[PDB]
Amino acid sequence: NHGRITQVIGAVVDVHFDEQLPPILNSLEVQGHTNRLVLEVAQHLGENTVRTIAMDATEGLVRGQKVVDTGAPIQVPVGVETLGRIMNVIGEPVDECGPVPAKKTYSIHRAAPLFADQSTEPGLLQTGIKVVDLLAPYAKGGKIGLFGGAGVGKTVLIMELINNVANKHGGFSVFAGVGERTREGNDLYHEMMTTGVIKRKKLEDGKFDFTGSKAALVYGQMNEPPGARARVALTALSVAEYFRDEQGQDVLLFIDNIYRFTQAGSEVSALLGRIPSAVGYQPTLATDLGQLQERITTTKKGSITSVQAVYVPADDLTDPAPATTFAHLDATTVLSRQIAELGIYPAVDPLDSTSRMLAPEIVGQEHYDTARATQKLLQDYKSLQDIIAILGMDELSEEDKLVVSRARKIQRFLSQPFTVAEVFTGKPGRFVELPETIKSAQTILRGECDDLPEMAFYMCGGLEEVRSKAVKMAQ
Amino acid sequence: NHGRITQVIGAVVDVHFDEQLPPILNSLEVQGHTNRLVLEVAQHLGENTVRTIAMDATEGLVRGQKVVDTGAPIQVPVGVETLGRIMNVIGEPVDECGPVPAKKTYSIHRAAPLFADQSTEPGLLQTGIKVVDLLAPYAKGGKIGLFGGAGVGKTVLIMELINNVANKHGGFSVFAGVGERTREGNDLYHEMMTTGVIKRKKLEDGKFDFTGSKAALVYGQMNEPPGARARVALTALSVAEYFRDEQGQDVLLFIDNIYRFTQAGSEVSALLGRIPSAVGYQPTLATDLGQLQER
Amino acid sequence: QTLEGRYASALFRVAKKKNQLEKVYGDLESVRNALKDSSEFRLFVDSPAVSVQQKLDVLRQLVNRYKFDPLTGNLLTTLVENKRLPMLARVADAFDAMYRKEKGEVKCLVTSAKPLSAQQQKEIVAALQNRAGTQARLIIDYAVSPQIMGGLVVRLGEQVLDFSVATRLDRLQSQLLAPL
Amino acid sequence: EMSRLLEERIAGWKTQTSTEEVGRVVSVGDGIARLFGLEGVQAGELVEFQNGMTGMALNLETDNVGVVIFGDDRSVLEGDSVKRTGRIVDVPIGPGLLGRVVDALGNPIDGKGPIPAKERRRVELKAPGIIPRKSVHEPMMTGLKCVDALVPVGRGQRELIIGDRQTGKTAVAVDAIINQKEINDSTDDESKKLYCIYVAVGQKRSTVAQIVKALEQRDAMKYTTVVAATASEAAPLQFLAPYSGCAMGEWFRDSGRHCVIIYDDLSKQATAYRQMSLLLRRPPGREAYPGDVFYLHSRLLERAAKMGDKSGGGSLTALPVIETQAGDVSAYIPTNVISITDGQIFLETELFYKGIRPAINVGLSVSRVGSAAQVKAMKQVAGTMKLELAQYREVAAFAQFGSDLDASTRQLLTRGTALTELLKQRQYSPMKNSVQVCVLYCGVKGYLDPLDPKEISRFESLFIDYINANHQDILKTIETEKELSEKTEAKLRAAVDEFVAMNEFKK
Amino acid sequence: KISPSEMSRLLEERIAGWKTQTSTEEVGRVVSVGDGIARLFGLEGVQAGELVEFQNGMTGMALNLETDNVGVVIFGDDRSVLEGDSVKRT
Amino acid sequence: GRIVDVPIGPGLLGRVVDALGNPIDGKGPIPAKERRRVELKAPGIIPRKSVHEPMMTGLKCVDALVPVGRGQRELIIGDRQTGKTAVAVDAIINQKEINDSTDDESKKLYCIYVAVGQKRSTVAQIVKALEQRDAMKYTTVVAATASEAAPLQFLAPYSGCAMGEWFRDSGRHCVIIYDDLSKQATAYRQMSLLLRRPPGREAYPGDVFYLHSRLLERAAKMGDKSGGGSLTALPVIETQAGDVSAYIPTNVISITDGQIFLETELFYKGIRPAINVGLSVS
Ligand SMILES: Nc1ncnc2c1ncn2[C@@H]1O[C@H](COP(=O)(O)OP(=O)(O)OP(=O)(O)O)[C@@H](O)[C@H]1O
Numbered sequence A: 001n002h003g004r005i006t007q008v009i010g011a012v013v014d015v016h017f018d019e020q021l022p023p024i025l026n027s028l029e030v031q032g033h034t035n036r037l038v039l040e041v042a043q044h045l046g047e048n049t050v051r052t053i054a055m056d057a058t059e060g061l062v063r064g065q066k067v068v069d070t071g072a073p074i075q076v077p078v079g080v081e082t083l084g085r086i087m088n089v090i091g092e093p094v095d096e097c098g099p100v101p102a103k104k105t106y107s108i109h110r111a112a113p114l115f116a117d118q119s120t121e122p123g124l125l126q127t128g129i130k131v132v133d134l135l136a137p138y139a140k141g142g143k144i145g146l147f148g149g150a151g152v153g154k155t156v157l158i159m160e161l162i163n164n165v166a167n168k169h170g171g172f173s174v175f176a177g178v179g180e181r182t183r184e185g186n187d188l189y190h191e192m193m194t195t196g197v198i199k200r201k202k203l204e205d206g207k208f209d210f211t212g213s214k215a216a217l218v219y220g221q222m223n224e225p226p227g228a229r230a231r232v233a234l235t236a237l238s239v240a241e242y243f244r245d246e247q248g249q250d251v252l253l254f255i256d257n258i259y260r261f262t263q264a265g266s267e268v269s270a271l272l273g274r275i276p277s278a279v280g281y282q283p284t285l286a287t288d289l290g291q292l293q294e295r296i297t298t299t300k301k302g303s304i305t306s307v308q309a310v311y312v313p314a315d316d317l318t319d320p321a322p323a324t325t326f327a328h329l330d331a332t333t334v335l336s337r338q339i340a341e342l343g344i345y346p347a348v349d350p351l352d353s354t355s356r357m358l359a360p361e362i363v364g365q366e367h368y369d370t371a372r373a374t375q376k377l378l379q380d381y382k383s384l385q386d387i388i389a390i391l392g393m394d395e396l397s398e399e400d401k402l403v404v405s406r407a408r409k410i411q412r413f414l415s416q417p418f419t420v421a422e423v424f425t426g427k428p429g430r431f432v433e434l435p436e437t438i439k440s441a442q443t444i445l446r447g448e449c450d451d452l453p454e455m456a457f458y459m460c461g462g463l464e465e466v467r468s469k470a471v472k473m474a475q
Numbered sequence B: 001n002h003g004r005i006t007q008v009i010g011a012v013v014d015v016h017f018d019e020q021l022p023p024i025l026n027s028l029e030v031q032g033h034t035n036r037l038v039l040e041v042a043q044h045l046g047e048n049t050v051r052t053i054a055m056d057a058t059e060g061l062v063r064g065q066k067v068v069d070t071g072a073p074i075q076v077p078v079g080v081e082t083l084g085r086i087m088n089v090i091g092e093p094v095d096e097c098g099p100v101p102a103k104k105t106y107s108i109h110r111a112a113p114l115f116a117d118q119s120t121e122p123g124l125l126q127t128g129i130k131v132v133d134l135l136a137p138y139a140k141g142g143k144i145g146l147f148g149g150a151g152v153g154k155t156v157l158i159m160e161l162i163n164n165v166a167n168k169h170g171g172f173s174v175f176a177g178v179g180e181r182t183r184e185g186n187d188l189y190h191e192m193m194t195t196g197v198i199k200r201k202k203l204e205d206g207k208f209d210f211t212g213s214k215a216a217l218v219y220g221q222m223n224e225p226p227g228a229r230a231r232v233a234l235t236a237l238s239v240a241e242y243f244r245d246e247q248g249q250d251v252l253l254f255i256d257n258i259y260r261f262t263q264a265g266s267e268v269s270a271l272l273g274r275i276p277s278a279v280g281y282q283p284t285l286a287t288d289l290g291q292l293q294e295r
Numbered sequence C: 001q002t003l004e005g006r007y008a009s010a011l012f013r014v015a016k017k018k019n020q021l022e023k024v025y026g027d028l029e030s031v032r033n034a035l036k037d038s039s040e041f042r043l044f045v046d047s048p049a050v051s052v053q054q055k056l057d058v059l060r061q062l063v064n065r066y067k068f069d070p071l072t073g074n075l076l077t078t079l080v081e082n083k084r085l086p087m088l089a090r091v092a093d094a095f096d097a098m099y100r101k102e103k104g105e106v107k108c109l110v111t112s113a114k115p116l117s118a119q120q121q122k123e124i125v126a127a128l129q130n131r132a133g134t135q136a137r138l139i140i141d142y143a144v145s146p147q148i149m150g151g152l153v154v155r156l157g158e159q160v161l162d163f164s165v166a167t168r169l170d171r172l173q174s175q176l177l178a179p180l
Numbered sequence D: 001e002m003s004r005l006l007e008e009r010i011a012g013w014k015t016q017t018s019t020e021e022v023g024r025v026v027s028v029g030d031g032i033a034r035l036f037g038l039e040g041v042q043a044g045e046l047v048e049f050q051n052g053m054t055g056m057a058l059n060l061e062t063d064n065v066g067v068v069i070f071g072d073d074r075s076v077l078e079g080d081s082v083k084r085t086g087r088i089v090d091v092p093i094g095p096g097l098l099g100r101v102v103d104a105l106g107n108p109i110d111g112k113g114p115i116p117a118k119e120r121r122r123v124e125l126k127a128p129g130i131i132p133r134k135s136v137h138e139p140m141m142t143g144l145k146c147v148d149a150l151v152p153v154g155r156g157q158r159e160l161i162i163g164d165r166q167t168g169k170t171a172v173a174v175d176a177i178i179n180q181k182e183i184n185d186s187t188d189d190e191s192k193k194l195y196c197i198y199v200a201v202g203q204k205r206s207t208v209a210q211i212v213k214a215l216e217q218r219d220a221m222k223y224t225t226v227v228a229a230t231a232s233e234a235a236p237l238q239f240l241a242p243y244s245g246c247a248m249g250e251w252f253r254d255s256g257r258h259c260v261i262i263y264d265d266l267s268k269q270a271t272a273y274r275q276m277s278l279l280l281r282r283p284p285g286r287e288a289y290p291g292d293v294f295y296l297h298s299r300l301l302e303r304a305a306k307m308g309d310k311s312g313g314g315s316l317t318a319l320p321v322i323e324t325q326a327g328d329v330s331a332y333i334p335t336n337v338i339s340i341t342d343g344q345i346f347l348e349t350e351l352f353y354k355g356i357r358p359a360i361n362v363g364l365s366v367s368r369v370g371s372a373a374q375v376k377a378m379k380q381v382a383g384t385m386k387l388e389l390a391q392y393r394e395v396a397a398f399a400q401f402g403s404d405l406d407a408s409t410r411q412l413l414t415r416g417t418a419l420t421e422l423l424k425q426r427q428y429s430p431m432k433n434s435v436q437v438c439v440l441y442c443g444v445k446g447y448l449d450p451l452d453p454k455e456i457s458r459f460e461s462l463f464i465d466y467i468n469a470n471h472q473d474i475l476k477t478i479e480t481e482k483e484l485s486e487k488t489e490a491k492l493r494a495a496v497d498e499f500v501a502m503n504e505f506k507k
Numbered sequence E: 001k002i003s004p005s006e007m008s009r010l011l012e013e014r015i016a017g018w019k020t021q022t023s024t025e026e027v028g029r030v031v032s033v034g035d036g037i038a039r040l041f042g043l044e045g046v047q048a049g050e051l052v053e054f055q056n057g058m059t060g061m062a063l064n065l066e067t068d069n070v071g072v073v074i075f076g077d078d079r080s081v082l083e084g085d086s087v088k089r090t
Numbered sequence F: 001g002r003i004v005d006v007p008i009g010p011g012l013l014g015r016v017v018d019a020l021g022n023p024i025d026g027k028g029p030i031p032a033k034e035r036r037r038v039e040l041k042a043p044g045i046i047p048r049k050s051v052h053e054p055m056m057t058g059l060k061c062v063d064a065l066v067p068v069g070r071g072q073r074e075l076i077i078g079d080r081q082t083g084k085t086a087v088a089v090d091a092i093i094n095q096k097e098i099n100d101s102t103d104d105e106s107k108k109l110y111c112i113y114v115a116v117g118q119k120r121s122t123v124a125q126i127v128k129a130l131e132q133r134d135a136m137k138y139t140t141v142v143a144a145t146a147s148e149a150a151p152l153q154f155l156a157p158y159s160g161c162a163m164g165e166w167f168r169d170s171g172r173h174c175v176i177i178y179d180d181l182s183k184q185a186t187a188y189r190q191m192s193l194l195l196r197r198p199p200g201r202e203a204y205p206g207d208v209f210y211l212h213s214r215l216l217e218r219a220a221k222m223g224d225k226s227g228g229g230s231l232t233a234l235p236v237i238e239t240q241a242g243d244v245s246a247y248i249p250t251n252v253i254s255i256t257d258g259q260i261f262l263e264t265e266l267f268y269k270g271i272r273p274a275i276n277v278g279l280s281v282s
């Protein structure tokens, strides 16, 4: 069906059809325009008028331009041909390697799996990181959250988890970028073409062969409108639902800055005519997120493991967006600036961090008791911060001084040099197994490492490195 | 032009013209009541209607009351005749000593100096005070904060700076009172007349002779509505730009408080209906402060 | 209710009382046609560059130069005084609907394909004895979901008599799937 | 049908019909205007009012048109006629702006004549993508020791200068500008030359004039252009000027040249956007800033890029500047820009009141690129310097007990204090890279530990003159090889020994 | 969104050519009431800060003069004022 | 023409249903013949009596220091991940012995778990934990999750109270656990803001008190003439940074017969359940 543009306000477009209207979520193509401008219907207003959100910039549009209804929502290709390839929200590849020769296309918008078609089985992940392997175990086939401000190491943590999981996964995987730096996007593309996660081969006649790849890529970045940022996660979720529904495989799904999915709505609703909520957020802040998260779930057909990075504006964890997001996660990891300023990396706060896979019926009883003892120790050390700041450690008793010593020691022991940090840290990376972490924590709690210094635990992995470093520091 | 009032909402007067609307910031004089009322245009609305902020009170105003357009913004008189005098935002004197017989008039809304007409060589200002010239050296064309109330010798510091800059640099000065206490204004005027900063010599016929002084005064009183406390610093600033541009002098300009300028701006924005910013302040705060301070 | 509704009710009332109905009806129809044919009268109405005095002068010159009542001129002077001249079209439509509803309804109606003069006569006479409204100007249509049985809507909103095949069939089925 | 009546009565009716390219003002206020007409106007289009003023067709409603005026609302009246220019908001680019102060729209203000014109690149363009982009693999010589050593700036980077007022941001910017003079004059090849753009937003005009005077003094306007949007200038112009500078730099980026833009105030751009939004009745948010501030800044900063081999190979760095309030970096705008940038240079009022200038902290300053934006000669030294400074920062908590502490700790404190006193520099006095390498070699080879702190100034100066008089061969060999081989290292140690012999110091 | 002049008792006069605008600048009709406020149509000529008087003896101050109505604040309770009650100046 | 209503009966026991009584277990329809209106008038002053029977929670600190009766309305307030659902699930699990060791419906305690805003994975985990212990033959569940629309989230607790009034009126007893009672207020805010109704403070409307009062005043202990039934209530609230000076926590504390505070400092010190028995009262 043909239609006319009547009004344009930033990332919003009002269209007028004569004969027959399109339903909501349907896609429309603008004709008198340089590029392929696509509009997604959002509302109906009367007078055969329709409101839409543009997947690109509106500079150049005219009141009178012509629009064509595709009759269906946005359609992204699916198959094993999307593997080893980048794809924007409208499915168009931006890898400059040719088109996507996929048979079938899926809709960006799909209803979530039902209640009966869910399977909550407790598994674990081998991340190689001590803090999460000990105190916040990650759930195979569940959702994981990395909450943090700006400059605390979310992207670095995600790159480390990619290196330590996806390469050792075998199944498929997807990476979505919602307002992330194009630099790090290109860096991930090149690190994947290096490590073999993406296997590009230049056939003659300029063709390409991505056969052998094990990771798809979807990128809607900061250089994109809100309409082109609030619809990328849905594309990635369609790409993963194809795998875990038809192919039956277990997939990974890394997402970078899901917060933008809300920020876009916040800089769109005002133009859509909606009343703002507390901090300018939407009234639909909970449903627009739940309709995204309920598509992420293990089922009887396959499994989605998910790793979402959640921005925290102004370092405020009481914001409505993270507050709502906390309810949807199976595992959590809250990074802190107070802990990053101490040079500890990963700067994970093990008290705000939590999980559901820490119970003794999932991890053993020695693991459970070690984790709970560590939490008790760190809380007892937190409780003395005020009196230490005012008066000093000399006021404390000897039990409290022992607690403070072991708490600082286990803080410095819960730090790890990653492999991707070698470029600006120099020191090589340290994968750390779980029984080694547990033995080390047990010994540090018992008191078999009180003789050692405090700076001997900094960036050492296990305890053999700590003891060698204490030896070398004795000189 | 000639227009009519259409509604009155406190200090916000909406006016209708039949043809050739006045520009924004132009002045309008109300006709048909005492206590001459002047309205500064601020916004066009359609239907040949404009919105204006009043410099005085609006009690006793009527719809359909006639209004004249002066054809230019508030125009203050300038000259060496404005020395030793007091003036309100609309240039009128409030010292009960006669009218200002100046040969000139300047608008209070003037464009700042361009990029070409600006001195790249900074230079100190020789005040005559030791702690000042040693540890906090002043500058020409500069702006100096003065954090201090009473019981400290601030009025005397002001008068000494005025006298020394007039003796040495030959420059005149201006004092702007932005929403000041009236008894404080009276005290400052009498202290100037005592210390010789002002020379008010009676004449035989009964007039006054404001002979060689060193400071003009521009007062926007607390009893005045918002819009005067906001266009007083601009009045004094035009009075000083007269000496800077034409006479070619290095002059001074004292401001009794710069926070009341902002109070008045916020008030005016609330009356005009602008959505307030973080802490209630207007959204045109830095812009208006720059329009002021870049001159 | 709405603004155009208000002016249309006022005009229908006064023109039924004093001047006449048909005069003001023809006047509104002529104005609407000139608005949709001239293509510059519309801009004259919408533009704000036109002063109120030029507006009233051109409106009075249209009054004199065309067959025109005083009621419509007062309507136009009111709409100009209140900045409601663009609502002339809407007002005219509101005036149009009431009179034809007072006299005789137009109704929609659907079949499968072309029926015959015989059953067309039967349909119209049956719907006429059902209405007991002496004037009926109908519509024919073709939608084949209701298989062939003649479905329709006699246009008053609260009577959509769904004489169809598939609809009765599905309703019956959903009824007889009841328990016991 | 009846048009004769309107033509007769209105006396000028036939001309007001073509509302597709000409319109009429209806309302004015708060930098916004409403027009009736202009049905064929594009969004973002440039619009020309009656009295020469200009604007941007921002909103296209069903009947009215909402326009933003690049000026004050006194040259625009209700009733005024409005035309279409027929083109999106655009600014001139190319060679011809170099050495020129200009407004947001390429209009000059220094009073020296008009500016030539290329095809007038647009303003709110889209950034590049992933394939034509390239990683950063070469430096941008700033001329500051601490920066070039510990916080290296690349060629294709986006690094933020964040710190409270009166801390030396404009000073860092202008040293970064002045250091490029020798590199540009010595080359005569635009593939290696680095141009620059300086964008002033909400800045005092006298300060801008002084900056321009100091650059004309030091011959640093052959390869720079300046874009001024000061406090008196309107808010749309402050919102623009950064985009105009980035459009001026896109010419070098796409033409294979290299460049660097310095937005000396982005908080003022954000304040002006908040202003325009609140005056457009939009709903405020956190600190009253709307939600389109992240997009506003990222549109601009994502254009700074290193083009690849097939897109010419050019580059465009970016040094945005931010003022904080009491050192708070947990605010909204600092975090919004830290989530966009690839690094951080922090500046303190404590260090600036004590006397350490440039007051560049080093525990908070970071750089994602890092060693890849250094030369090997400077790598070999700045690595050790960073390590020793980290050690000194760690063990400075117990410096008052230096007598109670071991000789190792006291040696660490001495070396760290020497380095801290060696990172100091004067205003408008940069340093070449070879000179920096020599000085940091002297510092990290213990030649300053016994020497008194206060002497290190004159020490450094004398040494510089020495190696600029005798060991020019060393300087050119370092600038050429970009490496400290064992031969040049031994030559340099010999020169340092000869200098400590021939010169007397306090220790 | 309707003005007091556009109600369907006045438009029955305007459409009917009635020109009984001889109702002076002294008298107006109440249009709305609530919470100690009244809103009148007429009194084109009333001053801001002026006293007005209702049918039932009460009095009020006219504060918000407008293009289509007049805003009045009441020195009492709103149970006395209703439905086009006449208001006259003092 | 029907006002919004839901089925009631023992056909809901063992089943999982949405806000409107439509089942989602995937096994069979809902065998219930009698319906009941969702929004109803609470019972007045006369058809009530004092609280004299205990509600065995299974915990120790609760059953000793913060006791709960049959007819009470006790709030469970704390931070995220503190043991709120676990408290409620233990309250549910303790009843299977009491119910197996009798056939007196006047003594059996049936249970209703309304889950607002939860995810289906969590609800499935809860159903699994209950089936693993045979704790579903006397419970029902009402899942209005996040994908489920705002009106269903808004209606689910009233549907639960409607299902519980059958027990309350028919001489039997009942307990109802509203989980994430703040998502109800979120949904009401959402609805009123998309219906263009004007907000109050924290962008909520003013009818939040009349949103919770209607709901919690349906919990009651009836007299010996109205059967002798009971409906106990155990609402749940998540605070942020322990801020109980907020609006919704304040309202619900001000309209309940007690409090059970839960803290993270006590949850990590080793006290689990982390009940603060100073602030907690009954
Ligand atoms: N390395 C330095 N050596 C000597 N003086 C310095 C140095 N750095 C700054 N100064 C002085 O600090 C003052 C401010 O200079 P500058 O304009 O660079 O600050 P800024 O960061 O631009 O602050 P703002 O933008 O708020 O005005 C100047 O008086 C300058 O002389």
Ligand SMILES: Nc1ncnc2c1ncn2[C@@H]1O[C@H](COP(=O)(O)OP(=O)(O)OP(=O)(O)O)[C@@H](O)[C@H]1O
Binding pocket: A327, A355, A356, A358, A359, F079, F080, F081, F082, F083, F084, F085, F086, F087, F238, F272, F273
């Ligand atoms: N008595 C207990 N013993 C051991 N672990 C417990 C105990 N109580 C709670 N936990 C743990 O508290 C965590 C949260 O469990 P629960 O389902 O009660 O969440 P909640 O308190 O309802 O908060 P939210 O629903 O917001 O996540 C779980 O990790 C649980 O294992």
Ligand SMILES: Nc1ncnc2c1ncn2[C@@H]1O[C@H](COP(=O)(O)OP(=O)(O)O)[C@@H](O)[C@H]1O
Binding pocket: A148, A149, A150, A151, A152, A153, A154, A155, A156, A157, A345, A346, A416, A417, A418, A421, A424, A425, D338, D339, D366, D367, D368
């Ligand atoms: N393993 C690490 N070790 C030491 N420092 C790190 C490590 N990871 C990150 N940092 C620091 O984290 C900062 C960037 O983290 P990142 O997550 O990319 O930022 P953002 O959260 O804004 O996306 C850098 O300063 C980097 O030096």
